[PDB]
Design a binder for this molecule. Structure first.
Ligand SMILES: *[C@@H]1O[C@H](CO)[C@@H](O[C@@H]2O[C@H](CO)[C@@H](O[C@@H]3O[C@H](CO)[C@@H](O)[C@H](O)[C@@H]3O)[C@H](O)[C@H]2NC(C)=O)[C@H](O)[C@H]1NC(C)=O
Ligand SMILES: Nc1ncnc2c1ncn2[C@@H]1O[C@H](COP(=O)(O)OP(=O)(O)CP(=O)(O)O)[C@@H](O)[C@H]1O
Ligand SMILES: *[C@@H]1O[C@H](CO)[C@@H](O[C@@H]2O[C@H](CO)[C@@H](O)[C@H](O)[C@H]2NC(C)=O)[C@H](O)[C@H]1NC(C)=O
Ligand SMILES: *[C@@H]1O[C@H](CO[C@@H]2O[C@H](CO)[C@@H](O)[C@H](O)[C@H]2NC(C)=O)[C@@H](O)[C@H](O)[C@H]1NC(C)=O
Ligand SMILES: [Mg+2]
Lengths: 1145, 362
């Protein structure tokens, strides 16, 4: 039960069943702050530490899990900061009787709290409108928070209740509204909104339809104000329960980051244990200075085996380093993903749209991709259709020369020869049509070979027919049924009232009716009961009553029509027209007619496979006359399915399946489908970089092969597997040689592929990230994909054959099989996948991958919301992956080992001083060199290496794509590289300590004037300064791209240790650290142990890099060698090969 | 328009130099650091070999000395003179007496007579060295009162329970009197009486005067101030109870703004060897001759086997005679010349051409 209330004070302190917060109602809050306060409270700012060793896992197990997942999920907190704190003046805290707006709190809005809308306000709750601020309720929305659709859809309220808009009728309602609960849907919501009038007190109705649907994600644009109550506020709705199932996609470096943090704490816990036991060994010696001049007891075990409450505070101070890590990588990942947004070369200027990241923290998953799962149309195809060829009554008529060049490879001398007299052919005859609404500018889709040869094949030879030219009556029945069966509507553009345009969801139906109104048969109107089509100008209305819908797991759509009374005294029978894929129409045909399996049906399939190797997307047209007696035997079967609750799942499909059982073939149809610009340059640029690209299409095998050549996916490699039969597995036990259809999948994958490659069943040497040497390619019929993913030990034969091949063309693949093959490669291998594609039928492929790219601008902006990046066309993927992904992988694979390095060069000399004060617990550093080291001293150059380091230029990343193959092989982030930076940080911590120690190891004066500076806090200026400079100039030597912006902020981080010492240790409040600027920096022994300890820190590693990039260089050193010698100087800046207008060079 | 801003920063086109470490760049970089640190290391050890010093330990003067002039055994004294590298005329002590009315653990003047065959040039510093005394423990270095260092009338509940640095074991005695220098640092000073003149025995009886002013930084007189207590609410710390045997009178309140031996002691040294300046003479030259300083023993170390000492030197610009800082420039110049010959013998017998050796083509 869902309720709403008014004329009730709605208390928060009511115990009885009269208010909201008892029944588990949603609250808008969609701990942490106390924990970070007491960590700073324990480390000696104010307060005391926690007693004993009662938190050595209890700090660690919360700090790698609870305040990792809170910092790494800061993307949605800023998205929550889109919900709250956009605040304006509202109508929340208003009594029942206060006629004036009051400034209040947005997340305090109540179920039934009426708020007047304004300009630029996100609608905070499920409001229900009754009156608009515009005439006729014309409300056109702008919905950046609901869906990717940044364009128009109609919001229309009922006409009679738009007049009531004054605010002097507030107290008229006293009841709750009848609605359905949240049931996890996005677009569909049919409710029932009844309320009551003012003047007398009578109730009236206002049924909400799809036009007046309102949601929390809605944002009502281009209206001024409206007055209506709200229903749902909080976290229980329909726009938020479709999501929330997702685990928000932590990246791969951000999931192996916890092995690095734990083995840091294990090194800390060894040091705070060896110290704590050698502290108690000191106290059990009974011959020390501690007895007389200190007032210590004659005992050991100071707290628990010596002073360990010191080393608790050392453990708890080093816990501020992982919190400093996740804040650092979430201002690098956020900044790397704001540079993807701000790139002008990822900008789609045709439809005004930059590359928008929907997930600001997976930018390094783009740099390790060896599987891209593509859809075919809409993404590798600009998805505007053009009707070319058709077959009627078996015989084909209709030609074209559009992209036969991808099939006519060698036998090509036909540059202009066919297209010359082709243009002469259509211009000489196609003026002689005789029908209304012939628009010859757009009418050149099917240029007339022959339909009637403009003489109509008159009826004077046979009034009764059946003696010749029955194709003339068959072709008119074809293009009628091609125009009649659709889902396209009629509108009128304001440019010309006579000329009418047609828009549809599926661009086939836009293209099928376009030629259908070129040769008679003008589809001009859509009646609420009928349908208006002028057959050769003669108007006659057809009433449709069942439109069988189309989703991509069905692969056909059907429609019914009632033939009006043409014979005297009889209501004639009905007719169904079904169009769809030929792989499902030939399976559903008649076996009792005269037009059965003979040459008249065999050459239709011969022509359509000839149309698909031509490159066109095929489709079949099929009908059956339904008898009027058996017509109303299945209409009432929709009363238990379509009129009931089950009108959206498989009970409606199986009751639609019973009518489509056998049909008769009417004809076929083929459609030109052009490619997007730069797709043959984008696939060719990704397949150089070692990425194994798949194409998960949904249409016929011979189409996607010919598209696969003209997009440069195939060179000469193909190896095909097909079911070549019509049976399935109905078995349960046995019968493996007797039954065929999975036996010839087992014998084809095993026994015919010991030839090229020699493999078997399971062995754990199965993870080899190399790009395969011998080029081969699987093309698979999809019905042979259901049989190769049905059981275990046959899905490992499909996966081990597709591991070893450069391209996979999965054809006739349902959208449930698209997502099943993505998560098969994803989990059973240790690989990282991308899934680019548009369309509402392509969202489970995107969500089941690691990165999901969504093509916008096309028919589907449903795949843009479930995506992570949202590029405009396809050709921006090679700029996204090879430039902004390959950079963003090597940036995060260098600042992570240089964050645990810079810890140990400083915070490990608190241990090396431990062996001289006998592990007792005097801090070497003065109280603010511990606060400001990892925060202000050395914290910025690892941020500007994560953000602004680039190994080569953005031109050279595309000219040499094979520099991406380092991240595919996982050679920049392994756990061996991490341990060498901790050994380099442990070497330079004995340099930064024992070089200031040996100036004081005879412990004389180290000053020019003899006055002496030998306090703990003055050795920790020798130690701190040569640690700050030697891990800020270690950053400068290990980055490429010495620009001016990073080198200036390394210089200002190298001189901020000299500047905070000059300010804090001249201030009077710094006790016993008082003129340490003018005492230490003015000492000539500071500036002589400075230049030789900064050397010895940088000396083993700059020599090793010199030995590494002379004799065993990387591929990114050798590219940087050639770039100084002018091999890349003729390429212009701002370069991309995936562009049709910029020249070659 | 929703087109992003092309300003050569969001396009990541900042001006850069892009360093490539080819062996025509870093091989002159290695022979440049080598010919700096070898030459600077020769100019430090030429300076740091001319520094002379005198170290005499005297912790075993009450027990292992006679009442006549006997030579110090060689385990205590060591002194280095650069003009006279072979010099073995040992200094001689003379314990004066157990003066018969004292605390009988260290008492009586320890007279020490040494010989200097050089000229300690202008600033002749006299330190004192202290070995195996732990002034860097945890509770020790955190026990004083900064408001009493700065000279305020802090209450009992201001020196006792302040956060961080409070004088926790030592804040009152029995009678409500706050110890005015409170904490383990001020309670446990060094209180031998060094002389204010090196007695020029033998030569001429023209003394060498040593002053105890300017012994610390002259910028320490801003956080060290004289106090304003009332001479009836304070009492000396319990190891100062042989210097103020009756208590504090109207006059004997220690001016710690001016008493600069105390200001040296209230910075606890960081390691287990302590050298603090206690005598100086910025005026004259210390000529060659046989001198005598006479230390009145008051501060005991032999109950923990510590050491007490004398450190008479003219300093340097890098401090005192510590030969580390000039050796390590020679090591940092020989390694940068070793690791330039390792990477030039390997490069000739070895080496690459500098284009198109990629694994991409392989
Ligand atoms: C200054 O020099 C004097 C010697 O002239 C050093 O002697 C310290 O004087 C205190 C006075 O209370 C003595 O402590 C004594 O302890 C034992 C056993 O508890 C007992 O004989 C007495 O009852 C008295 O409490 C002791 O002579 C000595 N303290 C020690 C050795 O710890 C004093 O250390 C020097 N002070 C400074 C600040 O340098
Ligand atoms: N509006 C429509 N009416 C009838 N048939 C259609 C149709 N749209 C597509 N079809 C046919 O249904 C078949 C399967 O539909 P599906 O939607 O899976 O193809 P598709 O267009 O999505 C290819 P892709 O997977 O690359 O997007 C296609 O071969 C197509 O010919
Ligand atoms: C207060 O105490 C100080 C020392 O604690 C006194 O100084 C000494 O006084 C004695 C006389 O009792 C004399 O020997 C000297 O004047 C001082 N001794 C030394 C060794 O110098 C001071 O006189 C006391 N003042 C009062 C008013 O009692
Ligand atoms: C300079 O030193 C001489 C040292 O001469 C001793 O003087 C004392 C009396 O002062 C006498 O008893 C000794 O016998 C002398 N000789 C020796 C070898 O000890 C002193 O006069 C003063 O310390 C200083 N003189 C002046 C004027 O400052
Ligand atoms: Mg699509």
């Amino acid at each position: 039960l869902r309720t709403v209330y008014y004329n009730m004070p709605l208390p928060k302190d009511m115990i009885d069943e009269e208010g909201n917060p008892i029944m588990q109602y949603p609250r808008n809050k969609i701990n942490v702050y106390f924990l970070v306060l007491i960590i700073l409270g324990a480390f000696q700012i104010f307060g005391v530490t926690n007693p004993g060793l009662s938190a050595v896992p209890l700090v660690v197990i919360v700090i790698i899990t609870a305040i990792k997942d809170a910092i790494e999920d800061s993307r949605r907190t800023v998205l929550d900061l889109e919900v709250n704190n956009t605040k304006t003046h509202i109508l929340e805290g208003v009594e029942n009787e206060d006629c004036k707006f009051a400034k209040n709190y947005w997340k305090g809005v109540k179920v039934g709290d009426i708020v007047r809308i304004h300009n630029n306000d996100e609608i905070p709750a499920d409001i229900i409108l009754l009156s608009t601020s515009d005439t006729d309720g014309a409300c056109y929305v702008e919905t950046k928070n609901l869906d990717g659709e940044t364009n128009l859809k109609v919001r229309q309220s009922l006409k009679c209740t738009n007049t009531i808009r004054t605010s002097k009728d507030i107290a008229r309602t006293k009841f709750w509204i009848e609605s359905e609960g949240p049931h996890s849907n996005l677009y569909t919501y049919q409710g029932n909104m009844k309320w009551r009038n003012l003047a007398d007190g009578e109730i009236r109705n206002e049924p909400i339809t799809i036009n007046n649907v309102l949601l929390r994600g809605c944002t009502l644009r281009n209206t001024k104000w409206a007055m209506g109550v709200v229903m749902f506020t909080g976290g229980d709705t329909k726009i938020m329960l479709n999501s929330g199932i997702t685990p928000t996609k932590k990246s791969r470096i951000s999931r192996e980051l916890n092995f690095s943090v734990v083995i840091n704490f294990v090194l800390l816990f060894i040091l705070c244990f060896v110290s704590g036991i050698a502290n108690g060994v000191y106290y059990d010696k009974k011959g020390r200075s501690r007895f007389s001049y200190e007032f210590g007891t004659i005992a050991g075990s100071a707290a628990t085996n010596g002073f360990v409450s010191f080393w608790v505070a050392v453990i708890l101070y080093q816990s501020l380093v992982p919190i400093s890590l996740y804040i650092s990588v979430e201002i690098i990942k956020t900044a790397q993903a704001a540079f993807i947004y701000g790139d002008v070369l990822l900008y789609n200027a045709k439809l005004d749209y930059p590359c928008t990241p929907k997930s600001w923290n997976i930018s390094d998953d783009l740099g390790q991709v060896e599987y891209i799962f593509s859809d075919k149309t809409g993404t590798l195809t600009q998805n505007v259709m053009e009707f070319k060829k058709c077959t009627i009554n078996g015989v084909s008529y209709g030609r074209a020369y559009t992209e036969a060049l991808a099939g006519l490879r060698k036998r090509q001398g036909i540059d202009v020869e066919t297209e010359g007299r082709r243009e002469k052919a259509e211009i000489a005859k196609d003026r002689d049509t005789m029908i209304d609404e012939l628009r010859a500018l757009s009418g050149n889709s099917q240029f007339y070979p022959e339909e009637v040869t403009f003489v109509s094949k008159e009826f004077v030879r046979d009034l009764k027919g059946a003696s010749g030219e029955v194709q003339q009556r068959c072709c008119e029945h074809f293009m009628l049924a091609l125009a009649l069966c659709h889902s396209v509507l009629v509108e009128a553009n304001p440019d010309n009232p006579k000329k009418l345009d047609l828009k549809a969801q599926s661009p086939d139906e836009a293209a099928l009716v376009a030629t259908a109104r070129d040769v008679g048969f003008s589809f001009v109107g859509k009646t609420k009961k009928g349908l208006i089509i002028e057959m050769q100008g003669i108007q006659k209305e057809f009433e449709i009553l069942n439109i069988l819908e189309f989703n991509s797991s069905r692969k056909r759509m059907s429609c019914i029509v009632k033939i009006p009374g043409l014979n005297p005294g009889d209501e004639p029978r009905a007719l169904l027209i079904c169009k769809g894929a030929d792989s499902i129409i030939y399976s559903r045909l008649s076996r009792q007619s005269g037009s059965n399996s003979e040459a008249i049906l065999e050459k239709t399939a011969l022509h359509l496979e000839q149309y698909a190797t031509e490159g066109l997307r095929t489709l079949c047209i099929a009908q059956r006359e339904l008898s009027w007696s058996e017509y109303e035997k299945w209409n009432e079967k929709y009363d238990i399915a379509a009129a009931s609750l089950a009108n959206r799942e498989d009970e409606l499909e199986v009751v639609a399946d019973s009518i489509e059982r056998e049909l008769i073939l009417l004809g076929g149809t083929a459609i030109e489908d052009r490619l997007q610009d730069g797709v043959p340059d984008c696939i060719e640029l990704l397949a150089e970089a070692g990425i194994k690209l798949w194409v998960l299409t949904g249409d016929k095998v011979e189409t996607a092969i010919n598209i696969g050549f003209s997009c440069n996916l195939l060179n000469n490699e193909m190896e095909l597997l097909v079911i070549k039969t019509t049976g399935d597995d109905v078995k349960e036990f046995g019968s493996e040689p007797s039954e065929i259809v999975d036996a010839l999948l087992s014998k084809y994958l095993k026994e015919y592929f010991n030839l090229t490659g020699s493999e078997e069943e399971i062995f754990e040497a199965k993870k080899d990230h190399e790009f395969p040497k011998g080029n081969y390619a699987i093309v698979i019929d999809g019905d042979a994909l259901k049989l190769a993913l049905y059981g275990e030990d046959i899905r490992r034969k499909f996966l081990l054959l597709c591991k070893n091949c450069r391209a996979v063309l999965c054809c006739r693949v349902s959208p449930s099989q698209k997502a099943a093959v993505v998560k098969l490669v994803k989990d059973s291998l240790d690989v990282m996948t991308l899934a680019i594609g548009d369309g509402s039928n392509d969202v489970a492929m995107i969500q089941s991958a690691d990165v999901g790219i969504g093509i916008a601008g096309e028919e589907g902006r449903q795949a843009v919301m479930c995506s992570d990046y949202a590029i405009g066309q396809f050709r921006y993927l090679a700029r996204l992956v090879l430039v902004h992904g390959r950079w963003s992988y090597k940036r995060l694979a260098e600042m992570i080992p240089e964050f645990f390095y810079k810890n140990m060069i400083f915070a490990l000399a608190l241990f090396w001083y431990g062996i001289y004060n006998d592990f007792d617990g005097s801090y070497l550093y003065e109280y603010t060199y511990m606060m400001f080291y990892n925060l202000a001293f050395t914290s910025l150059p690892v941020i500007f290496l994560g953000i602004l380091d680039q190994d080569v230029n953005d031109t050279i990343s595309l000219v040499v794509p094979q520099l991406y193959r380092v991240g595919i092989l996982r050679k920049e982030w392994n756990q061996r590289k991490f341990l060498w930076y901790m050994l380099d940080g442990l070497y330079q911590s004995i340099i930064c300590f024992f070089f200031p120690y040996l100036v004081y190891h005879k412990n004389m004066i180290v000053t020019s004037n003899g006055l002496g500076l030998d306090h703990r806090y003055f050795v920790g200026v020798y130690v701190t300064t040569i640690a700050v400079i030697s891990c800020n100039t270690y950053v400068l030597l290990h980055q490429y791209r010495w620009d001016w912006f990073s080198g200036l902020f390394i210089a200002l981080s190298c001189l901020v240790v000299f500047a905070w010492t000059g300010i804090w240790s001249s201030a009077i409040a710094s006790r016993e650290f008082f003129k340490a600027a003018a005492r230490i920096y003015g000492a000539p022994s500071f500036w002589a142990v400075f230049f030789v300890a900064v050397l010895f820190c940088l000396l083993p590693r700059f020599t090793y890099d010199s030995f590494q990039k002379f004799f065993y260089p990387t591929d990114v050193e050798i590219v940087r060698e050639m770039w100084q010698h002018g091999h890349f100087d003729h390429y212009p800046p701002g370069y991309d090969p995936t562009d049709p207008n910029r020249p070659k060079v | 328009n929703r087109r992003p801003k092309e300003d050569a920063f969001t396009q990541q086109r900042l001006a850069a130099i892009n360093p490539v470490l080819t062996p025509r760049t870093v091989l002159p970089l290695y022979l440049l650091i080598a010919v700096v640190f070898v030459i600077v290391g020769g100019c430090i050890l030429a300076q740091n070999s001319k520094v002379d010093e005198v170290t005499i330990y005297y912790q075993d003067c009450m027990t292992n000395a006679t009442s006549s002039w006997s030579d110090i055994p060689s385990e205590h004294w060591q002194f280095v003179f650069h003009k006279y590298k072979t010099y073995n005329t040992a200094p001689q002590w003379r314990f004066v007496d157990d003066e018969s009315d004292d605390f009988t653990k260290q008492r009586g003047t320890c007279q020490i007579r040494f010989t200097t065959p050089s000229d300690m040039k202008n600033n002749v510093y006299l330190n004192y060295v202290l070995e195996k005394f732990a002034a860097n423990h945890r509770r020790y270095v955190l026990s004083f009162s900064e408001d009493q260092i700065r000279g305020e009338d802090a209450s009992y509940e201001t020196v006792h329970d302040a956060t961080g640095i409070n004088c926790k074991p030592l804040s009152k005695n029995a009678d409500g009197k706050i110890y005015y220098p409170c904490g383990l640092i001020a309670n446990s000073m060094f209180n031998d009486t060094f002389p204010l003149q090196l007695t020029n025995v033998g030569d001429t009886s023209n003394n060498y005067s040593l002053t105890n002013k300017g012994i610390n930084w002259e910028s320490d007189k801003k956080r060290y101030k004289k106090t304003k207590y009332n001479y009836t609410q304070i009492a000396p710390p319990p190891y100062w109870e042989k210097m103020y045997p009756d208590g504090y009178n109207e006059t004997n309140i220690p001016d710690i703004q001016d008493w600069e031996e105390f200001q040296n002691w209230m910075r606890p040294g960081a390691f287990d060897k302590i050298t603090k300046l206690i005598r100086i003479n910025k005026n004259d030259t210390l000529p060659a001759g046989e001198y005598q300083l006479d230390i009145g023993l008051h501060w005991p170390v032999l109950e923990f086997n510590g050491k007490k000492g004398i450190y008479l030197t003219h300093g340097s610009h890098l401090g005192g005679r510590n030969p580390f800082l000039g050796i390590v420039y020679l090591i940092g110049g020989c390694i940068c010349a070793a690791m330039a010959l390792i990477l030039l013998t390997f490069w000739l017998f070895g080496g690459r051409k500098i284009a198109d050796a990629s694994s991409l083509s392989w």
